[PDB]
RNA sequence: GGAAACUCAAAGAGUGCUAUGCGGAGUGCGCGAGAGCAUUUCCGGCAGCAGAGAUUUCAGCUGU
């Protein structure tokens, strides 16, 4: 705030107006700049889920290694997190503390998988497109960027037809067919 | 105990009173040798009290010759007996701070009521007032010091070397 | 740990101590002239001259 | 109906031109300024923290030090930046303390040098020029006293008679010197105390009580005819040279190392003796040593006053000097360094700012007295601030964390162990004394100041 | 040597209702001699303070002080203050909470829908204008214009000068009322959960997670003289609190029902409170004695605010009613609504102003001007109240002409001289005292049947 | 700021000059206002001899008005208070300050 | 997407800047004096006189 002198810096070391201790290194701010998260509190409504599944994996590891409720529910949770695509392999239950991240549950969002399969070229442009309403997953259009996809629907992420970006890329390749109205 | 000092300039002589004494034991310290580089804390030491310029440039060359040979000239005699207070018998001998031990005994002979100091402390605040220079006078002069010592330098060099005119 | 333990040495009880501490000496709560006359040390030496042992009276 | 509001008017408060300073209009209302006590308390905390982070007291040594170890030091009492210094291989020097090097040095005597002082002599055949050259003198182990010139260069009145203008010869050894600061009469402690002036090569007077040597002595600064000495009878003997006689003696428990008179009070002195405390004695009532400065762990080797007369400095046989206020009796401040050892002669420079400590490992060092202040001229805002929070620390001195901060120093762990085991054995002596006082009929209370006195000639 | 404001300038002491040591005697006589000299020469400054407070008066027997139109005083006052009486009209976002800075220099407006703007209001200067979508109950400045904390829908956020956010507080799990203890650098929050919690905003620490045990906190108010926070709950209890001890220091019972608002005089000496019982109380604080109690004002008082000259401000829903001379201890100074038959022993209010149709959600005076900023549904209005301000501000602490360099230096000076969070005390002069135990006079270790008489001896 | 020191050096003469009935506080605050402005312009930075001259002129004029209201209201030549020597002694103090700060101009000398 | 300013906000560095502390006397001392001591010793009152000085200021007397 003033780049304090030497005696003032010695007389107060623990002052920091910018970065406190309970900011945790501003990781919510850093990863929402990384993944271009529109709204506030989206990090913490992800982090609540991350803490929830490590709480549930803790309680399932606490339950004894023989009963079918524990073994069925742990393979069920592991398959559910694979089906939401949060993981990539059906790995060990140790990856439910090393590998689940708020960065991963962000990485399954719509603009970041859009940039991942090169539909846009940057995630800011992807939020531009799907806020202008150009894309759909399967039949139904997507208007909000908070829709994260499943493992199933990383294949039908395509624009709508009469989306003029679809028209401009088809006319770039001059495969612009116009009987199908786009 | 350094009460006055005499600084000899190209334009004329100056005599400064010493308000506060510099510290004598810590004179080699960083915080004391930086106050002769700060001007606003060097003027807490030294007040200008007289400044007699040389009347002519010929007298400027004459005074430069007399100081270089360590003699006392008459303008210097005038400014010293104007400014320095006459003392009593031997109690409180008044004190100049001059810049050389050869100018010492000559003005001691011209003024037996005056004592001359040229030690490290005297040369210290001498080079302080030489560094700050014309900012001490606040315009109380008729002359610019760099061009004045340019002319005085060529004059003194020429008169020392006997450079011919024809 | 803010109020002191006992009554310190030159005083004798707490009314003496609090009647000492009753007036703040900063330039906020007191004027500038009363500030600069309220605060000056008991000794006050001039910085660069020898201190003679005093020889008074009848010089 | 009359309506007026504030007329802020934006001209008295922001200046009309871009150089002159704006007002700081100011209302001294306690209603305005809310917390007096907490705010200036925290300013006192910040001041004590600031002096504990600015306490950098070591200035520097002077020269490459001596050869064997400084055993005698004498400031000159009429000039600031020079002092004489003699080390017990035999070598005595005259240090200039501005540039921190000697004027000259000499191999003075064969054995140890045991005393030296400075003199403004008066010969009856000379105007003694005490401004172009400067005279010291020294008594030593080889039964000789030597009055010595120094070609000093501080004035420039002149343009040669360097060393040993005359020698005195004694039949026994010598231990101490000081000079009557008028009429060139000085006095020596040897196997017997002799008074002589610089004009004749014989002792003008014997002065001793009986057969006991005189370990040190010191003249007065005012009432210069009176002087004190300390003999290895564990004894203080005062002499008066008007009557030319010793005049009283007290005997204490352990041996008094060194006296120093008061410059201001003129009838109070300080004895430093080998029990680990110095004793601010009166002169007119020598039965109660009216202060005892206690906090040492070994023998206190010398002491002198500040020239301002209210702050004294003891240097002791443990490797640490410390500076006392007069009216407390405990350490204001401790100076020590790893390289100083067995510090023998500590004196106070003549402007009450520096503490010269001559150790036993050879070196003689400079220290500041107020270890947090600095020695440049200060603008009056700095002077007002430093003086302000000095007064503020002084009045909030008894708060129980300002006191722990302003009391915290870092002593070497030898002194730490010795001080704490001294504390546990003093508590033990106090407890066993309390038990005897509970039982026994008359174990009368003796004061701490009256404890160390074992006797006094001339009871009244 | 008279100095009529000596009664304002004295500093009382813990007294008994003479010694023997001569040195102690002369020390004490020098101490209280210089105390009297310092008090006299400190009260010799009222010749040197620049301008007097404003005022008005009827100077007739017909017209009154309260039925004076803002149009009339805006015509009869100077152009600068008549121009400073701004009236912002902001319609689409909600009711606008108003917080000036500690000086008069800036202004923070919060709409309950989404809209917070930190702006200079004297010169028109947008500093930070942000619509954040969730609801914002109240907000305040921190130490300068440089930082302001907004109490959003749940999480309390603090913000930089240009509108960037700096901290989403993980604690302060909701908030309704913020305040800032300025010398302590403590951001204090209270709300729907029964948690008063203090935050040292310099080092970014928490300080106290104080449980209120009294439901939500309906209105909180800072005492500006000993820095205790006065919460007013649903019980009518106005309990006043310090971060050092969890139990509430002093539990006043001011009103009935919930307490709608609390406001502390800047001398720390009076507390005005309004409840939902349609009641307003004036309180002594340093003696804890209910001064006088206006019962049954004709509608629930929504907010009270007291100026820097002891000037009561009561917001009666669509009304703003200002009483002068309402904070004395007499029976005259009870604030009433009518001089019954022209009775000269009432406080008919100093001014009054009825708004159009908009509920005023908070009053708040401007510090060093004679005008109060009232915040209502459709925006903000400054009201020229001619005796509502310290004309002679003290420029050593807070300055309405403060530039950038002295702003940085004044904040870092307060940042070094921040009082610690423990010395929040019920009275501020209990730090240089001695303990209540460890008794006063010090001791210097010197003083620390005839047949039965026949059958004795056995 | 030593301007505060000068400004509250000049308070006791106006204190006695108000408590005896020749000025009122409603105008001694005005002369204190202008004296505050003059002292600030004087011991500010980049000051000038014309600022010293106008301060001397204003203080001489308020001295003459002091004598005028002294002989008008009190009907005496002086009231033997502190003020009568004070106002010209601080005029001389202004002169001393101006000669020390600006020993150049012989007009002010 | 790049560029104008007296657009503003926030930091940093450099250059400056001074940054800057009862009285005339008289009366006896302090080695021609003020650097302190101490005051009824007359005054800092009234008009006039007449010597001056730019109507209002000084120089010596009457009473006061």
Q: What does the H/E/C string look like for chain B?
A: CCCEEEEECCCEEEEEEECCCCCCCCCCCHHHHCCCCCCCCCCCCEEEEEEEECCCHHHHHHHHHHHHCCCCCHHHHHHHHHHCCCCCCCCCCEEEECCCCCHHHHHHHHCCCEEEECCHHHHHHHHHHHHHHHHCCCCCCCCCHHHHHHHHHHHHHHHHHCCCCC
Rounded to whole angstroms, the Cα distance separating D279 from D290 reads 7
Nearest by CB to D26, which of E51, E267, E395? E395
Query: How was this structure obtained?
Result: cryo-EM
Straight-line distance from CA F35 to C1' G46, in Å? 36
* Contact in structure between D42 and E420 (CB atoms under 8 Å): yes
Tell me the CA–C1' distance in angstroms for A94 and G4. 61
State CA C1 to chain mean position distance: 24
G31 C1': nearest CA residue: B88
Is A10's CB within 8 Å of D53's CB? yes
Distance between D135 CA and the closest CA of chain B, angstroms: 19
- Residue E432: closest CA among D405, D35, C29: D35
Residue of D4, D28, D36 lying closest to E386 (CB–CB): D4
Q: Which residues of E touch A12 (CB under 8 A)?
A: 202, 415-416
Contact A71, A79 (CB under 8 A): no
CA atoms of B125 and B5, how far apart (whole Å): 9
DSSP, collapsed to helix, strand or coil, labels residue F20 as coil
Q: Confirm if E282 and E270 have CB atoms less than 8 A apart.
A: yes
Count the Cβ atoms, other than its own, within 10 Å of residue E442. 17
Crossing angle of the two packed helices B145-161 and B57-68, in degrees rounded to 10: 70
Q: Where do we find the tokens 């509920």?
A: E359
Query: Which residues, at least 6 apart from E401, have a Cβ–Cβ distance to it below 8 Å?
Result: D13, D14, D22
d(CA B79, CA B74): 9
Residues of B in contact with D99 (CB under 8 A): 27-28, 120
Report the DSSP beta bridge partners of residue E141: E148
Token reading at E373: 């900023």
List C-alpha distances in Å: D88 to C50, D18, D97, D139, D175.
29, 69, 21, 12, 12
Q: How far is the C-alpha of D190 from the C-alpha of D241, rounded, in Å?
A: 18
**Distance (Å, rounded) from C-alpha E131 to C-alpha E94?**
12
Pair D292, D449: CB distance under 8 Å: yes
Report how far residue D271's alpha carbon sits from residue D228's, in angstroms, rounded to the nearest whole number: 10
Taking only Cα atoms into account, the Rg of chain C, rounded to an integer number of angstroms, comes to: 18
Cβ burial of D421 (10 Å; 0-12, 13-18, 19+) is exposed
Tokens for E169? 């507080």
Q: Are E65 and E56 in contact (CB under 8 A)?
A: yes
Residue F71 CA to nucleotide G45 C1', Å? 14
- C-beta separation of C48 from D80 below 8 A: yes
CA distance E222 to chain D (A): 13
Phi and psi at E309, nearest 5°, equal -125, 20
Which B positions 100-159 lie with beta carbon below 8 A of chain F? 138-140
Q: Is the CB of F43 under 7 A from strand G?
A: yes
3-class secondary structure, D286: coil
Residues in E touching C33 (Cβ below 8 Å):
41
Please count the other Cβ atoms lying within 10 Å of the Cβ belonging to residue A33: 10
**Token pair 């005994």 is at which residue?**
B105
Across the interface, whether the CB atoms of E27 and C15 are under 8 A apart is answered: no
For residue E251, the surrounding DSSP H or E stretch is strand E250-253
Which of A8, A11, A12 has the highest number of chain D CBs within 10 A, making it the mutation to test binding with D? Answer: A11
Pairing of strands E270-275, D113-119: unpaired
Strand order across the beta sheet in which E290-295 lies: E259-264, E270-275, E279-284, E290-295
Cβ of A1 within 8 Å of Cβ of E408? The answer is: yes
Report phi then psi at E79, rounded to 5.
Answer: -70, -35
* Beta carbons of B156 and B65 less than 8 angstroms apart: yes
Q: Could you give the CA distance from residue D96 to residue D103 in angstroms, rounded to a whole number?
A: 6
At D55, list the tokens.
């306490």
Q: What token pair was written down for F72?
A: 């008008």
Short-list E214, E48, C50, CA closest to B21: C50
Q: What are the backbone angles phi and psi of residue A161, rounded to the nearest 5°?
A: -95, 145
Of E58, E81, E418, the CB nearest to D5: E81
Q: Closest partner residue to E63 among D1, D13, D38, by Cβ? A: D1
Q: Name which of B50, B138, B141, B142 to mutate to probe chain F: the one with the most chain F Cβ atoms within 10 A of its Cβ.
A: B138
Instruction: Please state, in angstroms and as integers, the Cα–Cα distance from residue D238 to each residue in D183, D222, E37, following that order.
Output: 20, 15, 48
Query: Three-class SS of residue D450?
Result: helix
Find residues 13-52 of chain F whose CB sits inside 8 Å of chain D: 33, 36-37, 40-41, 44-47
Q: Which two tokens stand for residue A46?
A: 């992800």
Half-sphere exposure of D8 (CA within 13 A, CB side): 21
CA atoms within 13 A on the CB side of A121: 1
Note whether F8 contacts E50, CB cutoff 8 Å: no
Find where tokens 């009554």 sit: C7
Residue E122 CB in 7 A reach of strand G:
no
The three-class DSSP label of residue F65 is helix
CB–CB of D144/D82 below 8 Å? no
Give the resolution to one decimal, in Å.
4.9
Question: Judging by DSSP bridges, how do beta strands E270-275 and E259-264 pair with one another?
Answer: antiparallel
Q: How long is the CA F92 to C1' G49 vector, in angstroms?
A: 36
If 0-12 CB within 10 Å is exposed, 13-18 middle and 19+ buried, where does residue E420 land? middle
Tell me phi and psi for residue D312, to 5 degrees. -110, 165
**D100 token code pair:** 């921190």
User: Whole-angstrom Cα distance, residue E217 to residue E190?
Assistant: 6
Beta bridge partners, E455, equal: none
Q: How far is CA A97 from the centre of its chain?
A: 17
CA atoms of E138 and E303, how far apart (whole Å): 14
**Nearest to residue E196, comparing CAs of E259, E247, E154, E262?**
E247
DSSP code of E134? S
| Contact list, E423 vs chain D (CB under 8 Å) | 38, 41
* H or E segment and range at residue E44: none
By C-alpha distance, which of B27, B92, E401, C59 is closest to D13?
A: E401
Chains A and F touch (3+ CB pairs under 8 A): no
CA distances from B36 to B9, B84, B127, B129, D354 (A): 19, 25, 8, 8, 22
Please, which residues bridge with residue D187 across strands? Answer: D178, D195
Cβ-based contacts of F3 with chain D (< 8 Å)? 21
Instruction: Tell me the residue length of chain B.
Output: 166
* H or E element at residue F36: helix F25-42
Count the Cβ atoms, other than its own, within 10 Å of residue E44. Answer: 20
Rounded CA-CA distance E420/E205 in Å is: 12
DSSP element (H, E) containing E17: none
- Bridge partners (DSSP) of residue D149 are D135
Written as six digits, the tokens of D39 are: 């705010």
Report which secondary-structure segment, H or E, holds F30. helix F25-42
E424 within 8 A of E196, measured Cβ to Cβ: no
**Which residues are registered as beta bridge partners of D231?**
D214, D235
Give the gap in angstroms from C-alpha A3 to the nearest C-alpha of chain D: 19
- Residues A173 and A130 sit within 8 Å (Cβ to Cβ): no
Chain D residues in contact with A10 (beta carbon < 8 A): 53
Write out which nucleotides of chain G lie closer than 7 A to a protein Cβ.
8-13, 16-23, 30-31, 44-46
State, as a whole number of angstroms, the distance between the CA of F48 and the C1' of G54.
31
- Helix B57-68 with B74-83: angle, nearest 10 deg: 80
Dig out the tokens for E346 from the structure: 């009432």
D205 neighbors D195 (Cβ within 8 angstroms):
yes
CA D195, chain centre distance (Å): 26
Crossing angle for the helix pair A27-35 and A42-62, to the nearest 10 degrees: 110
- F76 CB burial (10 A radius; 0-12, 13-18, 19+): exposed
User: Distance between CA atoms of E186 and E188, rounded to whole angstroms?
Assistant: 6
Q: In chain D, which residues have their Cβ closer than 8 Å to the Cβ of B100?
A: 156
Q: Which chains touch D (3 or more CB pairs under 8 A)?
A: A, B, C, E, F
Chains that touch A (3 or more CB pairs under 8 A): D, E
Measured in degrees and rounded to the nearest 5, phi and psi for residue D430 equal: -65, -40
Percent helix / strand / coil, chain D, rounded to 5: 15, 35, 50
Distance in Å, alpha carbon of C34 to nearest chain F alpha carbon? 10
Asked if residues E101 and E144 have their Cβ atoms less than 8 Å apart, the reply is yes
How far apart CA E155 and CA E151 sit, in angstroms, is: 7
Q: CA E203 → CA A20, D187, D444, E206, E415, distances in Å?
A: 7, 67, 59, 9, 10
Give the ranges where A36-154 is alpha helix by DSSP (H): 42-62, 68-83, 95-98, 102-107, 110-116, 123-132
* E420 touching C (Cβ < 8 Å): no
Other CB atoms within 10 Å distance of the CB of residue D233: 19
Coil, strand or helix at E107: strand
Query: Which nucleotide, over all strands, has the C1' atom closest to the CA of E160?
Result: G10
Distance from CA of F74 to the nearest CA of C (A): 32
Q: Which of F99, F103, F109 to mutate to test the interface with B (most CBs of B within 10 A)?
A: F103
Query: CB neighbours of D422 closer than 8 A, spacing ≥ 6?
Result: D276, D297
| Residues E240, E254 contacting (CB under 8 angstroms) | no
Alpha-carbon span D170 to E368, nearest angstrom: 87
Q: How far apart are CA C57 and CA A50, in angstroms?
A: 91
Neighbours of chain B (3+ CB pairs under 8 A): C, D, F
Mark whether F and D touch (3+ CB pairs within 8 Å). yes
**Residue F73 CA, nucleotide G55 C1', distance (Å):** 23
Other residues' Cβ atoms within 10 Å of the Cβ of residue D19 = 10
Task: Look up residue E113 and give its DSSP letter.
Answer: S
Q: At what angle do helices F11-19 and F83-101 cross, to 10 degrees?
A: 160
Cβ pair D26:F45 closer than 8 A? no
**Residue at token pair 């001014």:** E351
């Amino acid at each position: 705030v003033r780049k304090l002198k030497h005696h003032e810096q010695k007389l107060l070391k623990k002052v920091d107006f910018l970065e406190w201790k309970q900011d945790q290194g501003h990781r919510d701010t850093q990863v929402m700049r990384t993944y271009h998260i529109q709204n506030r509190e989206d990090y913490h409504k992800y982090n609540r889920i991350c803490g929830d599944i490590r709480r549930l994996a803790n309680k399932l590891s606490l339950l004894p290694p023989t009963d079918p409720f524990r073994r069925k529910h742990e393979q069920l949770l592991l398959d559910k997190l694979y089906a939401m695509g949060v993981l990539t392999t059906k790995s060990k239950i140790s990856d439910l503390e090393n590998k689940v991240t708020v960065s991963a549950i962000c990485r399954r969002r719509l603009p970041v998988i859009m940039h991942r399969l090169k539909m846009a070229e940057t995630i800011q442009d992807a939020v531009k497109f799907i806020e202008q309403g150009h894309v759909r997953v399967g039949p139904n259009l997507i208007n909000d960027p908070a829709y994260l996809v499943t493992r199933n629907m990383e294949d039908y992420v395509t624009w709508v037809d009469n989306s003029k970006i679809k028209k401009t890329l088809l006319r770039y390749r001059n495969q612009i067919d116009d009987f199908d109205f786009s | 105990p350094i009460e006055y000092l005499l600084f000899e300039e190209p334009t004329g002589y100056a005599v400064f009173k010493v308000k506060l004494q510099q510290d004598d034991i810590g004179s080699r310290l960083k915080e004391v040798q930086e106050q002769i580089n700060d001007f606003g804390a060097f003027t807490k030491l030294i007040e200008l009290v007289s400044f007699a310029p040389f009347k002519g440039a010929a007298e400027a060359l004459e005074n430069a010759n007399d100081i270089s040979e360590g003699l006392v000239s008459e303008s210097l005699k005038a400014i010293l007996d104007l400014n320095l207070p006459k003392a009593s018998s031997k109690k409180k001998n008044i004190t100049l701070a001059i810049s050389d031990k050869n100018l010492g005994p000559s003005i001691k002979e011209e003024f037996p009521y005056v004592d001359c100091i040229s030690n490290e402390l005297a040369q210290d605040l001498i080079r302080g007032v030489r560094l700050h220079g014309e900012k001490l006078f606040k315009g109380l002069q008729s002359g610019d010091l760099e061009r004045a010592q340019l002319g005085l330098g060529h004059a003194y060099s020429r008169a020392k070397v006997k450079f011919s005119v024809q | 740990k803010y109020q002191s333990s006992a009554v310190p040495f030159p005083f004798e009880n707490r009314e003496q101590y609090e009647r000492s501490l009753r007036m703040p000496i900063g330039q906020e709560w007191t004027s500038r002239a009363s500030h600069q006359e309220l605060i000056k040390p008991r000794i006050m030496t001039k910085p660069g001259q020898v201190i003679d042992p005093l020889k008074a009276p009848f010089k | 109906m009359k309506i007026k509001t504030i007329k802020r008017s934006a001209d008295d408060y922001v200046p009309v031109k871009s150089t002159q300073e704006s007002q700081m209009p100011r209302n001294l209302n306690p209603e305005l300024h809310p917390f007096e006590r907490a705010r200036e308390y925290t300013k006192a905390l910040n001041a004590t923290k600031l002096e504990r982070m600015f306490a950098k007291p070591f200035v520097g040594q002077l020269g490459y030090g001596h050869r064997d170890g400084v055993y005698a030091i004498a400031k000159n009492y009429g000039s600031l930046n020079k002092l004489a210094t003699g080390s017990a291989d035999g070598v005595i020097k005259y240090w200039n303390m501005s540039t921190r090097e000697e004027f000259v040095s000499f191999k003075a005597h064969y054995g140890l040098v045991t005393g030296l002082c400075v003199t403004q002599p008066r010969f009856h055949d000379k105007k003694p020029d005490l401004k172009s050259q400067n005279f010291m003198l020294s008594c030593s182990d080889d039964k000789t006293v030597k009055l010595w010139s120094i070609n000093v260069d501080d004035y420039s009145n002149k343009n040669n008679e360097e060393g040993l203008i005359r020698t005195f010869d004694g039949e026994s050894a010598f231990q101490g010197i000081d000079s009557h600061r008028e009429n060139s009469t000085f006095a020596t402690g040897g196997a017997k105390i002799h008074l002589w002036d610089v004009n004749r090569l014989k002792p003008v007077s014997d002065l001793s009580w009986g057969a006991d040597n005189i370990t040190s002595l010191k003249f007065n600064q005012n009432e210069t005819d009176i002087l004190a000495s300390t003999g290895s009878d564990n004894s203080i003997v005062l002499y008066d040279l008007r009557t030319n006689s010793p005049t009283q003696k007290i005997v204490q428990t352990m041996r008094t190392n060194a006296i120093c008179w008061n410059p201001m009070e003129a009838f109070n002195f300080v004895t430093a003796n080998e029990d680990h405390n110095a004793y601010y004695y009166d002169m007119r009532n020598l039965s109660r040593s009216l202060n005892v400065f206690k906090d040492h762990v070994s023998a206190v080797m010398d002491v002198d006053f500040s020239p301002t007369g209210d702050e004294i400095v003891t240097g002791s046989y443990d490797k640490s000097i410390r500076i006392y206020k007069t009216n407390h009796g405990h350490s204001r401040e401790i100076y020590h360094t790893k390289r100083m050892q067995h510090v023998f002669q500590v004196k106070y420079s003549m402007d009450s700012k520096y503490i010269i400590s001559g150790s036993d490992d050879g070196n003689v060092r400079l220290w500041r007295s107020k270890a947090w202040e600095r020695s440049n001229v200060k603008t009056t805002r700095e002077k007002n601030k430093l003086e302000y929070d000095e007064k503020l620390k002084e009045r909030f001195r008894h708060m129980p964390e300002i006191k722990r901060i302003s009391r915290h120093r870092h002593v070497p762990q030898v002194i730490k162990k010795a001080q704490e085991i001294k504390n546990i054995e003093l508590s033990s002596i106090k407890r066993r004394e309390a038990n005897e006082r509970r039982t026994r009929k008359d174990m009368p209370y003796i004061s701490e100041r009256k404890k160390q006195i074992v006797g006094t000639v001339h009871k009244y | 040597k008279e100095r009529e404001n000596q009664n304002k300038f004295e500093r009382s002491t813990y007294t008994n209702n003479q010694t023997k040591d001569k040195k102690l005697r002369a020390g004490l006589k020098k101490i209280d001699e210089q105390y009297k000299k310092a008090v006299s020469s400190a009260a010799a400054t009222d010749y040197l303070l620049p301008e007097s407070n404003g005022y008005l008066e009827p100077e007739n027997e017909l017209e009154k002080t309260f039925k004076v139109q803002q149009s009339e005083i805006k015509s009869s006052v100077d152009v600068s203050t008549a121009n400073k009486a701004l009236d912002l009209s902001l319609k689409e976002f909600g009711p606008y909470h108003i917080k000036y800075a500690k000086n008069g220099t800036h202004l923070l407006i919060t709409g309950r829908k989404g809209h917070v703007a930190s702006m200079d209001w004297r010169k028109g200067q947008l500093r930070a204008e942000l619509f954040l979508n969730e609801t914002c109950h109240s907000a305040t400045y921190l130490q300068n214009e440089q930082y302001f904390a907004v109490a959003q829908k749940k999480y309390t956020f603090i913000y930089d000068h240009e509108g960037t956010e700096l901290h989403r507080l993980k604690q302060h799990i909701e908030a309704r009322h913020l305040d800032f203890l300025p010398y302590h650098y403590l951001l204090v929050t209270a709300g729907e959960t029964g948690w008063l919690k203090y935050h040292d905003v310099s080092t970014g620490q928490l300080v106290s997670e104080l449980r209120t045990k009294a439901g939500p906190t309906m209105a909180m108010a800072q005492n500006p003289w000993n820095a205790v926070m006065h919460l007013g709950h649903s019980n009518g209890t106005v309990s006043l609190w310090s971060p050092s001890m969890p139990e509430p220091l002093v539990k006043l019972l001011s009103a009935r029902g919930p307490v709608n608002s609390i406001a502390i005089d800047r001398s720390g000496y009076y507390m005005a409170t309004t409840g939902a019982d349609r009641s307003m109380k004036i309180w002594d604080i340093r003696n804890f004695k209910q001064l006088h109690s206006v019962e049954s004002l004709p509608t629930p008082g929504t907010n009270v605010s007291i100026s820097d000259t002891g000037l009561l401000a009561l917001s009666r829903g669509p009304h703003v009613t200002l009483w002068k001379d309402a904070l004395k201890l007499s029976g005259d100074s009870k604030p009433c609504f009518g001089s019954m038959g022209g009775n000269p022993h009432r406080n008919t209010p100093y001014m009054s102003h009825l708004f159009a149709g908009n509920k005023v959600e908070n009053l708040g005076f401007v510090p060093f001007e004679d005008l109060l900023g009232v915040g209502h549904q459709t925006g903000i209005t400054n009201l020229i109240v001619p005796g509502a301000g310290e004309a002679n501000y003290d420029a050593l602490e807070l300055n309405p002409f403060e530039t950038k360099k002295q702003r940085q230096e004044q904040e870092v000076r307060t940042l070094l001289n921040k009082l610690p969070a423990d010395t929040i005390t019920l009275d501020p002069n209990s730090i240089g005292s001695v303990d209540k135990r460890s008794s006063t006079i010090r001791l210097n270790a010197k003083d620390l049947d005839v047949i039965e008489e026949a059958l004795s001896r056995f | 700021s030593k301007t505060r020191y000068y400004l509250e050096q000049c308070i006791p003469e106006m204190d006695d000059l108000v408590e005896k009935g020749l000025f009122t506080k409603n105008e001694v605050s005005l002369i204190m206002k202008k004296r505050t402005d003059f002292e600030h312009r004087l011991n500010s930075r980049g000051s000038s001899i014309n600022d010293y001259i106008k301060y001397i002129n204003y203080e001489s004029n308020v001295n003459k008005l002091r004598a005028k209201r002294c002989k008008r209201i009190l009907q005496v030549k002086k009231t033997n208070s502190l003020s009568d020597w004070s106002i010209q002694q601080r005029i001389g103090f202004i002169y001393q300050r101006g000669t020390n700060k600006f020993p150049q101009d012989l007009k002010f000398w």
